[PDB]
Design a binder for this molecule. Structure first.
Ligand SMILES: NC(=O)C1=CN([C@@H]2O[C@H](COP(=O)(O)OP(=O)(O)OC[C@H]3O[C@@H](n4cnc5c(N)ncnc54)[C@H](O)[C@@H]3O)[C@@H](O)[C@H]2O)C=CC1
Ligand SMILES: Cc1cc2nc3c(=O)[nH]c(=O)nc-3n(C[C@H](O)[C@H](O)[C@H](O)COP(=O)(O)O)c2cc1C
Ligand code: SF4
Ligand code: SF4
Ligand code: SF4
Ligand code: SF4
Ligand code: SF4
Ligand code: SF4
Ligand code: SF4
Ligand code: SF4
Ligand code: SF4
Ligand code: FES
Ligand code: FES
Ligand code: FES
Ligand SMILES: [Zn+2]
Lengths: 247, 622, 159, 152
């Protein structure tokens, strides 16, 4: 444990520990900073460049840094509502919104920051902001099925070799971790289609309900036949084993 | 193979090599430039022809060998005959028997094969008297063009690996102390002090440690690092051994491109020669310091030159830069301490430890010592490798060394640093070319390639070209570089097609400024420098392109040619060039172009010998 | 059958170290002129690395292609010097003569038009490389001779 | 653990107030399906409540790879809802079905003892759910049964 450092965010003094990001300091100090790519469960990447803040150092001018990753090791003053910060956020928001105009998250952010879609600067709007959230979620889960497959403006998150992924599991965490809702995970009856691959779902024998696929349960290595029961059915079946004695 | 167990063995073998060189001084050695620029110009054929021709001459045939880049790439195939130490230019297969019979055998120097100054009309027998060469201080490239890069005997006989023997006596602390006191700043464009990097890698106790040589040359139009790695890889190997013994590293990597087969093959050959001789491997020179060099060869990618991307590319990942607040000297390759310097930075280390710190600091300006290699290309009369001390004015490099612009068109700008740098107009030609001064002007020393623009180079089109290159070379990780580059490309494609406006120029400057301060790695942050430099120094061209006129005659359809009726010689090459035949002139006399009939494409303007045709504003009235 | 033997030879040359992924992919590119799905799957299995990482490495570099190139690859330099000398006109001339675009193979499967950042021959600019032969100081007219000569020689050389 | 949740199914009357209290505390509304305790009513009036008992060797923790499941200082398995990516592996791994998934909030949900103030215990009318120190987990039931011999 190192000595905590005292820093000032928008005129608010606070002692934060060593090796703590600016975003964490703002979160514990009640300050709100917009983020798109950062996920607290995934190894940070700093892609979207939307959580820009001004870092003012003793004798040094304010510079833009990403709050989601910039650590607090010295005495600095952070400004989140500066004109330069607002201009940078407007620029990044314009780019992201032109990339994904139908997104609710980006439209909400634009309404917050007064940004409108431009028809001249909308090249290939495909509802993907390349935040890499899905790739990192897949990597942390254990199956590294999906991954980026190009560089530049043509960058895309695809299954390997542009075919139904051979290492996908069907959990659907990549679709859950997606700001723009570009990934779709549709379930019809006992079928789950994600990344244009069909996964068979599991139905509990006394309920007909579904919460996971066969591939996911095989991946987790849970050989208990109760794992195929839905949580309510499994809970009821276990609770039936308790012979309550009314006398 | 001689395995030098002790430094005394290396010194004695070098003594024997020098002794043989003294006895071989009379031998007519012929060396052929086999660098990339001259191999592409057809010098391998001359090498083979000379090898065949020298066969059957006396009891001992004259020696023939190949070298690296000699420096004057505009001269094409260069063969240097040692019998008279004669510089030969534009050597073809037809000239091989004549060169042999007259120069090597008869001693007759071929007058027509010597270099002629186009300015003063003087023939130069040797290379040292060439004005292009006379105004240079070739220190890092001293062996290039004079040794066989694959022969470690040539390197050893030229005081090679002796600075390693000195370093083994100095000790790791003294080597780093001498490096910092030499003010050696990184030659990879960043300009960071090499001594601080080595010291901050020695301070951290996490082991193992690595040294890397960034042989990637991502800058388009730049080849000095590749020409160094091809002229003499041993000056890089020795640097990687000194910098490893100083910091304690036991493994070394040279990161190059698979697109450089000559550099890769010569570096691998040099390594294979070193391991045979004991300079690489185990117990080097009886010092108990084991060090071995490998060669990671990647594909062609501009971003892979970036340190954080280079580490990932070496590790076996796509070369995508990553945001890190801990320097590579603490968590670099596989999160181990790692010193990454480009091949020219490593090549200066043997010079520093061989010629001394005080001598090294005597070159250049204050805080910017030593020399720098420039890949002077573009519209210059003289193209090739230029090595000059720091503080040399740009006017020297472009006029005294470069000779001026092609033909006689007026100098307009000089792009320094490539896509990560900015253009400098003709007004600022007295600036020193050291690290700080070019930064002050808004440009950047960068890689080292200097691109010269003349009146036939539109600065709007130059900025559009750089933006297109950075669009196609972006890694796409972060929003600014991925998308704002596309926005800048759209704005610049509007301006070059006549579909622009002043608000477009204002949005262009704003977008460039916001892209600079918001990108992730160095590609995006400096991607706005060409646009900002062209806007700052050449805003009149942007306004004219807004109005629909291109004064340089590059953007098609935005101009109408005007044939001079005084300086036109009536050659008619423009008339035979016009796709629409919109040129009507007197036979063997002045020509006239119809403004309405002409569309504007620039085909005629580049072929006029008198340069009497230039752009004129279109007549939008009718 | 023989294709798998070639893949096995290339894989057995290098160690089971994932840092050799790109070099193995370059050897496969030189063996097959492109990157197949089967060979890349064998490369992914050999290094015990996920397929998506191999695909990202394969498609990150413009040298590696997912569809076969022609017998001879035409590399037209797009460096700063060549562009300043008129490399855009050379690229447009080759594109229009072959009725293709940059990074696109012709219908006959002989020519693969490619653009290279630099070749080190900026003195002789604009410069073009067909196969391993470098042509420089070339205008639009010189393109017509070079392309058809190289095609008629390519069909002879292969058969 | 300082204190533990103790279930006595013999005392349960099946009113379901535990589910309503848990849902009111957690989701802000009376929604028994999102309660962390479920009461199951069988034949002959045999109602038994079931909730997470904070297993000392928890399969749910052993199966999670996002790091969203961890034991706090009070020996309670806690879900970090910000770290949950929705793989639902903890849902399969729990052998009793005490781990559910809140699809609207996109997080795994399990009993957390309300960080020391259980509402189900507070609003249970029959003490079928109780909050006792761990060092006396079964003393009360044992004393209640032993009192049947003292009345003799
Ligand atoms: N072909 C070429 O040589 C090209 C070079 N460049 C140049 O690259 C430069 C950008 O370099 P970057 O690595 O992005 O940044 P930088 O200039 O801040 O750092 C340069 C080098 O210094 C090292 N370094 C910096 N501070 C250090 C410290 N305190 N301790 C240890 N090592 C330290 C970095 O790790 C890196 O190896 C630009 O100036 C640009 O002109 C860009 C394009 C092409
Ligand atoms: C996009 C980009 C491309 C780069 N390309 C190269 C390169 O080709 N060669 C090089 O030596 N440095 C290149 N660099 C600079 C490296 O980040 C780093 O400074 C270099 O590997 C070591 O520089 P040094 O020799 O000054 O220590 C590049 C940087 C960026 C951001
Ligand atoms: S698919 Fe969704 S999560 Fe993945 S990169 Fe695109 S926007 Fe981000
Ligand atoms: S559903 Fe498939 S691709 Fe998505 S995170 Fe799960 S395993 Fe990965
Ligand atoms: S600035 Fe460009 S090259 Fe650098 S990380 Fe961002 S997208 Fe990639
Ligand atoms: S090319 Fe020049 S000199 Fe020749 S006819 Fe045309 S304008 Fe006159
Ligand atoms: S610009 Fe083009 S159309 Fe006009 S005169 Fe010259 S060659 Fe002819
Ligand atoms: S509140 Fe108590 S008595 Fe009522 S159902 Fe829940 S556990 Fe049973
Ligand atoms: S959720 Fe299930 S497995 Fe995990 S501690 Fe609770 S009862 Fe045990
Ligand atoms: S659903 Fe959430 S808490 Fe459960 S295992 Fe997955 S990430 Fe962990
Ligand atoms: S202790 Fe709290 S979270 Fe657990 S079941 Fe009771 S009310 Fe719900
Ligand atoms: S949230 Fe920090 S850069 Fe995206
Ligand atoms: S390549 Fe031969 S002089 Fe430069
Ligand atoms: S610019 Fe074309 S070879 Fe270098
Ligand atoms: Zn069920």
């Amino acid at each position: 444990m190192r000595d905590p450092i005292d820093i000032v965010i928008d005129g608010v003094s606070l002692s934060v520990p060593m090796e703590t990001t600016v975003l964490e300091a703002a979160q514990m100090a009640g300050v709100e900073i917009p983020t798109l790519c950062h996920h607290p469960a995934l190894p940070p990447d700093g892609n979207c460049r939307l959580c820009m803040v001004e870092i003012l150092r003793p004798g040094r001018r304010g510079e833009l840094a990403i709050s989601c990753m910039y650590p607090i090791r010295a005495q600095i003053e952070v400004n989140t509502k500066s004109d330069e910060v607002i201009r940078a956020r407007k620029f990044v928001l314009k780019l992201l919104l032109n990339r994904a105009p139908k997104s609710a998250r980006l439209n909400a952010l634009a309404n917050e920051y007064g940004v409108s879609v431009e028809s001249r600067f909308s090249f290939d709007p495909d509802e993907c902001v390349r935040c890499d959230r899905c790739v990192r979620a897949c990597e942390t889960l254990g199956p590294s099925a999906i991954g980026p497959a190009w560089r530049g403006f043509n960058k895309r998150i695809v299954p390997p070799f542009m075919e139904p992924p051979r290492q996908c599991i069907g959990c659907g965490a990549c679709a859950d971790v997606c700001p723009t809702g570009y990934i779709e995970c549709v379930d019809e009856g006992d079928e789950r289609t994600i990344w244009d691959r069909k996964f068979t779902l599991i139905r509990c024998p006394i309920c007909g309900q579904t919460y996971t696929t066969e591939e996911a349960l095989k991946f987790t290595g849970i050989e208990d036949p109760d794992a195929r029961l839905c949580p309510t059915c499994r809970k009821r079946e276990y609770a039936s084993k308790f012979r309550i004695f009314v006398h | 193979m001689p395995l030098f167990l002790k430094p005394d063995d290396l010194r004695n073998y070098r003594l024997k090599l020098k002794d043989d060189l003294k006895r071989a001084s009379l031998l007519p050695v012929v060396r052929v430039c086999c660098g990339t620029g001259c191999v592409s110009n057809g010098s391998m054929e001359v090498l083979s022809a000379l090898e065949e021709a020298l066969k059957g001459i006396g009891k001992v045939e004259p020696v023939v060998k190949f070298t690296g880049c000699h420096g004057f790439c505009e001269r094409g195939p260069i063969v240097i005959v040692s019998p008279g130490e004669i510089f030969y230019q534009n050597v073809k297969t037809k000239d091989v028997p004549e060169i042999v019979q007259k120069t090597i055998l008869d001693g007759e120097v071929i007058e027509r094969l010597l270099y002629r100054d186009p300015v003063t009309k003087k023939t130069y027998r040797s290379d040292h008297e060439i004005p292009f060469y006379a105004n240079q201080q070739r220190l890092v490239l001293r062996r290039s063009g004079h040794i066989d890069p694959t022969s470690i005997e040539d390197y050893i006989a030229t005081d090679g690996y002796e600075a390693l023997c000195l370093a083994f006596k100095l000790g790791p602390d003294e080597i780093i102390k001498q490096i910092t006191d030499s003010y050696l700043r990184g030659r990879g464009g960043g300009g960071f002090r090499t001594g601080y990097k080595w010291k901050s890698c020695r301070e951290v106790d996490d082991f193992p440690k690595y040294v890397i040589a960034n042989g990637d040359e991502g800058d388009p139009g730049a080849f000095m690092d590749r020409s160094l790695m091809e002229g003499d890889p041993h000056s890089v190997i020795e640097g990687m051994i000194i910098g490893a013994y100083a910091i304690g590293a036991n493994e070394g990597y040279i990161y190059v491109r698979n697109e450089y087969p000559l550099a890769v093959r010569r570096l691998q050959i040099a390594i294979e020669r070193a391991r045979e001789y004991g300079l690489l491997g185990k117990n080097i020179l009886g010092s108990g310091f084991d060090f071995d060099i490998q060669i990671c060869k990647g594909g062609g990618a501009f971003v892979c030159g970036e340190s954080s991307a280079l580490m990932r590319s070496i590790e076996g990942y796509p070369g995508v830069p990553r945001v890190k607040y801990i320097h590579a000297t603490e968590q670099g390759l596989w999160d181990k301490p790692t010193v990454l310097n480009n091949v020219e930075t490593w090549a200066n280390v043997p010079i520093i430890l061989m010629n001394g710190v005080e001598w090294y600091k005597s070159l250049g300006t204050e805080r910017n010592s030593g020399t720098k290699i420039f890949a002077l290309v573009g519209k210059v009369k003289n193209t090739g490798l230029v090595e000059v001390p720091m503080g040399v004015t740009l006017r020297k490099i472009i006029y005294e060394i470069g000779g001026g612009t092609l033909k006689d068109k007026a100098f307009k700008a000089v792009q320094t640093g490539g896509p990560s740098g900015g253009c400098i107009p003709a007004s600022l030609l007295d600036l020193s070319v050291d690290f700080d001064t070019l930064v002050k002007a808004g440009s950047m020393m960068g890689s080292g390639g200097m691109i010269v623009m003349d009146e036939r180079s539109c600065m709007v089109d130059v900025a559009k070209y750089f933006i297109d290159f950075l669009v196609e070379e972006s890694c796409g990780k972060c929003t600014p570089c991925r998308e704002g580059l596309k926005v800048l490309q759209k704005l610049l494609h509007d301006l070059t097609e006549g579909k622009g406006s002043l608000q477009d120029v204002g949005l262009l400057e704003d977008t460039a400024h916001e892209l600079g301060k918001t990108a992730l790695c160095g590609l995006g942050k400096t991607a706005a420098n060409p646009v900002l430099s062209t806007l700052k120094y050449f805003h009149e061209e942007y306004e004219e392109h807004v109005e629909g006129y291109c004064r340089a005659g590059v953007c098609t359809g935005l101009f109408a040619a005007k044939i001079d009726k005084d300086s036109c010689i009536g050659c008619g090459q423009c008339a035979r060039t016009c796709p629409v035949k919109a040129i009507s002139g007197e036979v063997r006399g002045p020509h006239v172009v119809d403004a309405l009939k002409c569309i504007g494409c620039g085909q005629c303007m580049d072929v006029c010998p008198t340069n009497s045709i230039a752009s004129s504003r279109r007549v939008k009235n009718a | 059958a023989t294709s798998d033997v070639a893949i096995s030879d290339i894989l057995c040359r290098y160690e089971k170290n994932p840092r050799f992924l790109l070099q193995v992919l370059l050897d496969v590119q030189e063996k097959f002129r492109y990157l197949p799905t089967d060979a890349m799957r064998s490369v992914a299995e050999y290094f015990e690395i996920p397929e998506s990482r191999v695909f990202a490495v394969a498609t990150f570099y413009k040298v590696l292609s997912l569809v076969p190139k022609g017998e001879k690859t035409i590399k037209v330099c797009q460096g700063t010097a060549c562009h300043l000398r008129g490399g855009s006109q050379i690229l447009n001339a080759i594109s229009e003569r072959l009725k293709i675009r940059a990074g696109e193979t012709t219908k006959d499967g002989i020519f693969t038009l490619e653009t290279v950042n630099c070749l080190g021959c900026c003195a002789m600019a604009p410069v073009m490389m067909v196969g391993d032969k470098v042509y420089g100081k070339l205008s639009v007219a010189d393109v017509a001779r070079i392309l058809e000569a190289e095609k008629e020689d390519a069909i002879i050389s292969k058969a | 653990m300082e204190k533990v949740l103790v279930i006595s199914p013999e005392k349960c009357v099946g009113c379901g107030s535990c589910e309503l209290a848990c849902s009111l505390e957690k989701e802000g509304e009376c929604r028994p399906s999102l309660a962390r305790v479920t009461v199951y009513r069988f034949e002959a009036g045999a109602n038994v409540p079931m909730t997470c008992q904070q297993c000392d060797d928890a399969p749910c923790i052993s199966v999670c790879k996002a790091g969203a499941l961890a034991r706090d200082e009070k020996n309670v398995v806690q879900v970090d809802s910000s770290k949950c990516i929705g793989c639902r592996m903890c849902v399969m791994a729990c052998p009793f079905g005490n781990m559910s998934y809140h699809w609207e909030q996109s997080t795994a949900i399990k009993c957390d003892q309300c960080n020391g103030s259980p509402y189900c215990v507070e609003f249970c009318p029959t003490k079928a759910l109780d909050y006792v120190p761990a060092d006396a987990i079964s003393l009360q039931k044992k004393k209640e049964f032993s009192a049947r011999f003292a009345k003799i």
